[PDB]
Amino acid sequence: PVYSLTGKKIFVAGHTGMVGSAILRRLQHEDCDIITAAHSVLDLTRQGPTENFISGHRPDVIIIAAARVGGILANSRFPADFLYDNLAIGMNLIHAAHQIGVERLLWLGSSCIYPRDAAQPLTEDALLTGPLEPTNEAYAIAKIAGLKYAQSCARQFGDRFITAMPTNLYGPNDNFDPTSSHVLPALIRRVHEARMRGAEPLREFLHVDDLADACLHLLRFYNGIEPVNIGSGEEISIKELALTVARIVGYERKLLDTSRIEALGWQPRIHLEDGLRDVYRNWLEE
Numbered sequence: 001p002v003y004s005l006t007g008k009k010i011f012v013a014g015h016t017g018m019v020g021s022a023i024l025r026r027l028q029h030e031d032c033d034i035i036t037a038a039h040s041v042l043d044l045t046r047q048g049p050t051e052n053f054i055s056g057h058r059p060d061v062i063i064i065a066a067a068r069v070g071g072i073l074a075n076s077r078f079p080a081d082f083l084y085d086n087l088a089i090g091m092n093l094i095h096a097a098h099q100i101g102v103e104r105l106l107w108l109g110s111s112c113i114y115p116r117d118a119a120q121p122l123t124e125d126a127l128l129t130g131p132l133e134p135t136n137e138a139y140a141i142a143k144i145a146g147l148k149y150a151q152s153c154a155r156q157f158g159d160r161f162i163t164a165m166p167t168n169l170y171g172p173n174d175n176f177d178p179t180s181s182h183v184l185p186a187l188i189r190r191v192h193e194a195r196m197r198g199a200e201p202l203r204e205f206l207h208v209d210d211l212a213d214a215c216l217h218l219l220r221f222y223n224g225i226e227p228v229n230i231g232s233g234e235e236i237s238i239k240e241l242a243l244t245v246a247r248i249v250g251y252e253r254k255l256l257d258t259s260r261i262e263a264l265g266w267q268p269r270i271h272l273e274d275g276l277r278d279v280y281r282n283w284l285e286e
C-alpha cells in the first residue's frame, strides 16, 4: 500500500453525480474526514472560489467526479459547454491542488476519449495515437488536457496525481430519463413498456460501485504517471444483453485492456445479472 486514506481529508468533487455519489458511499465506511461542496454553492469552473475552497479546507486527497456529461445529441449541439466546463474544472482543481501540495489527486477520464479507430482492446498507451471521434471531440479534448496536466504535474513536481479511465457505467443513480443515452436503462425501460403492454456486436458494462472501489484502490496502491483503465472484463453482446434484460423484465468492439489494474490485484466483484436485478427493482420501487 503506497498510501492510506485513514486519517485523511478527502474532497469528493461532484458528489451528487452518479460516480461522485458512489465514491461518497464507499467512503463513509472509511475512517476519514469527507468534504463536499454542492454545485449550487461552488461552481468549479470559477478559479477564484475553487482555489479558496481548496486553500481553506486543505484536503489531503481530491477526487474529481465533477463534470458535464451527456449523450450524443448534447455533445454535438453544445460542444463549447462540454469542452469548457470539464476543462475549467480539471484545470482549477489540479492547479489549486498543486499549489498547496495536495497529497493525492484523482482525475476521471473516459473510454470515449481514445482514438476512434484504435485497436481493440484499448490499452492506455493508445491515447492520442489517432483522430478522435468527432461527435464528442470537444468533451474528449477537455478530458485529455486535464489528464495531461495532471501528468505534467507528476512529472515536473512529483505530485501524486493520477487519472482513471472508466468504461460504460450502470447501477445506482443512473439516468432512467426517456431521453437518457445509457443503453442499459433504456433497455430495461423499452422492455418493461413492452412487458406490461404485451407486444411481440460486443459491449461492456461496469458497475458504479465496482468503479468506486477501483478508484480508492488506485489511490491506495497506484503511483504511476500513466492512466489506468478500469473496465468490466465480463463482456456481453447487445443480443445476449437483450435476452438477459428480457429475462429480468419477464418479456416474451469497444472494450478496454485491463492488464494494468489486474496487476494491482483488483477485479470487479459485481456480476451483471446481480446488479441488473438489483437495479431493476429499485427502478420499480422508485
Ligand SMILES: NC(=O)c1ccc[n+]([C@@H]2O[C@H](COP(=O)([O-])OP(=O)(O)OC[C@H]3O[C@@H](n4cnc5c(N)ncnc54)[C@H](OP(=O)(O)O)[C@@H]3O)[C@@H](O)[C@H]2O)c1
Pocket: 013, 014, 015, 016, 017, 018, 019, 020, 038, 039, 040, 042, 043, 044, 045, 065, 066, 067, 068, 069, 085, 108, 109, 110, 111, 112, 165, 166, 167, 168, 169
Ligand atoms: N465511459 C466512461 O469511461 C465513463 C462513463 C461515465 C462516467 N465516466 C467518468 O465519470 C465522470 C462523471 O460521470 P457522471 O456520469 O458521474 O456525471 P454526472 O452524473 O453528471 O455528475 C456530474 C457531477 O458534476 C457536478 N457538476 C457539474 N458541473 C459542475 C460545476 N461547474 N461545479 C461543480 N460541480 C459540478 C454535478 O453537479 P449537479 O448535477 O448537482 O449540478 C454532478 O455532481 C465523467 O466526466 C467521466 O470522466 C466515465
